[PDB]
């Protein structure tokens, strides 16, 4: 049963561990803002929690912090008592509703499991108000605490008291949700909960080293003045897009020639949009090596080179840097450090006839290999025997070119496939080629 009230000037803790006296200091850290709403109960964690109560019969005796609150996340647990305060961080498989039977942990959690940490110390607890500040930062879990006398009152006392550090655990686990844990059978109790935010305070240390007053730096203009004096008294416009690089020409050419005679096209002095590439059919092979396909429009180069041809279905894997094969070193060789993309798709429906399609040839015999980015066109008898071929065929005299064959009744791996490779390069010249830009 929630409620609201006023936080007044409470919840200031020693930020660090350096002694000071009779000096006004300015600190930037998480704090509870002055005069803020603190929910009064009878829960998200955010960046930290200020928790304050007054029930002096130990009805409040601990807390459970965790992320998902199940075995799926180790749940930090603090339990108070009269003998010894206990802190555990074991991966408790969390139950639906936590409570101690008074004292089996089973209702809290199913089974004790792996925990590299465990801690026990003097009891935290000692008409009296107890205030705690919990926060975990940079893989450390810090608890500050303080207690004070008070007259019977239904809201936070007017006045001032600083909070001294209590524990500083090196745990380093994520927490996003916490839950209190009372000591009842039904009943009810009371406590106050508030949330910290980053702020800039001005703290005043008296002669004995204890904080005795502090002023906020964002509450109201008077406080801003007190802090300053250090005393207590999208639009984007760009040219219209006209010059589009033509990619629908290097595509659906309907004449990709042979692999041994592959057309090379140079593209420059235009805006190149790669979106239209994905407007065609799903591609059998779509591989980019030196460039992530997402960022092609973001990074631009000097000139582009496109090479298109038709190869067999099972020979697609051979078209890559570092590959070896009949198509790899005799018809088209690629550099090891090739930067660009490769596209390949089936064209059996367009490059096959029942009688037989033999207009797609390829080199079969060659004296040596081919350097990367090279073509060979000459057709001479490949001499194999010791005797000269003398420009004629026969024994150990075979032609270097062999004709591929495609028919619609063939199975996968042999059907004709169209392959287009895009290559990109840089040199000492203006790029003059970049992608579309809004």
């Amino acid at each position, epitope marked *: 049963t929630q409620s609201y009230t006023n936080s007044f000037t409470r919840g200031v803790y020693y930020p660090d561990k350096v002694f000071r006296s009779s000096v006004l200091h300015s600190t930037q850290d998480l704090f509870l803002p002055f005069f803020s709403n603190v929910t009064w109960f009878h829960l998200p964690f955010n960046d930290g929690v200020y928790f304050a109560s007054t029930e002096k019969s130990n009805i409040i005796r601990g807390w459970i912090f965790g992320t998902t609150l199940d075995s799926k996340t180790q749940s930090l647990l603090i339990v108070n008592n009269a003998t010894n305060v206990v802190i555990k961080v074991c991966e408790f498989q969390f139950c639906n509703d936590p409570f101690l039977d008074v004292e089996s942990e089973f209702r809290v959690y199913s089974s004790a499991n792996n925990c590299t940490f465990e801690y026990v110390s003097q009891p935290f607890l000692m008409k009296n108000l107890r205030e705690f500040v919990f926060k975990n930062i940079d893989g450390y879990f810090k608890i500050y605490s303080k207690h004070t006398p008070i007259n019977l009152e239904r809201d936070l006392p007017q006045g001032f008291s600083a909070l001294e550090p209590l524990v500083d655990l090196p745990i380093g686990i994520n927490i996003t949700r916490f839950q209190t844990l009372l000591a009842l059978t039904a009943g009810a109790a009371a406590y106050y909960v508030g949330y910290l935010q980053p702020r800039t305070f001005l703290l005043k240390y008296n002669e004995n080293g204890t904080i005795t007053d502090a002023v906020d730096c964002a509450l109201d203009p008077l406080s801003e003045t007190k802090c300053t004096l250090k005393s207590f008294t999208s639009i984007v416009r760009f040219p219209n897009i006209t010059n589009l690089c033509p990619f629908h020409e290097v595509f659906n050419a309907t004449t990709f020639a042979s692999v041994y005679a592959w057309n090379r096209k140079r593209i420059s002095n235009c805006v190149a949009d790669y979106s239209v590439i994905y407007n065609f059919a799903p591609f059998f092979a779509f591989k980019c090596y030196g460039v992530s396909p997402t960022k092609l429009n973001d990074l631009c180069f000097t000139n582009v080179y496109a090479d298109s041809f038709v190869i067999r279905g099972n020979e697609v894997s051979q078209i890559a840097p570092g590959q070896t094969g009949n198509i790899a070193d005799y018809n088209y060789k690629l550099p090891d450090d090739f930067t660009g993309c490769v596209i390949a798709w089936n064209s059996n429906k367009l490059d096959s006839k029942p009688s037989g399609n033999y207009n797609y040839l390829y080199r079969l015999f060659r004296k040596s290999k081919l350097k990367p980015f090279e073509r060979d*066109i*000459s*057709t001479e008898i490949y001499q194999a025997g010791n005797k000269p071929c003398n420009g*004629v*065929a026969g024994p150990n005299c075979y032609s270097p070119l062999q004709s591929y064959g495609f028919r619609p009744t063939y199975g996968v791996g042999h059907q004709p496939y169209r392959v287009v490779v895009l290559s990109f390069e840089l040199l000492h010249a203006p790029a003059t080629v970049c992608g579309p830009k809004k």
Partner: nanobody
Amino acid sequence: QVQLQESGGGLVQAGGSLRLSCAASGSIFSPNTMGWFRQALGKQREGVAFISSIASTSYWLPVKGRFTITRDNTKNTVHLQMNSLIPEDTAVYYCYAVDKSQDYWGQGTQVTVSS
């Protein structure tokens, strides 16, 4: 557009001679290689012969010493001569330009030898 014109086919009795020619027009970059291929009804494209820009002549086994090629550099045309024809040569012929780019084929020439 590259168009190659083929001519000189038809019907001829056994032992006769025929005179095919294809003339290439269009781009035709200078390092051109032009050949001839054979195809009969029911059989695939069979290479007949080739000549490169070096004017070297290459011929296949089934037609040893029976077909010849002449090249015209002025008009850059190819003339194929058939001599000592036999019925095994009954097939349509297509001359093919290798060039350096997209390859162009022919419309075919009817060559029939039978008795």
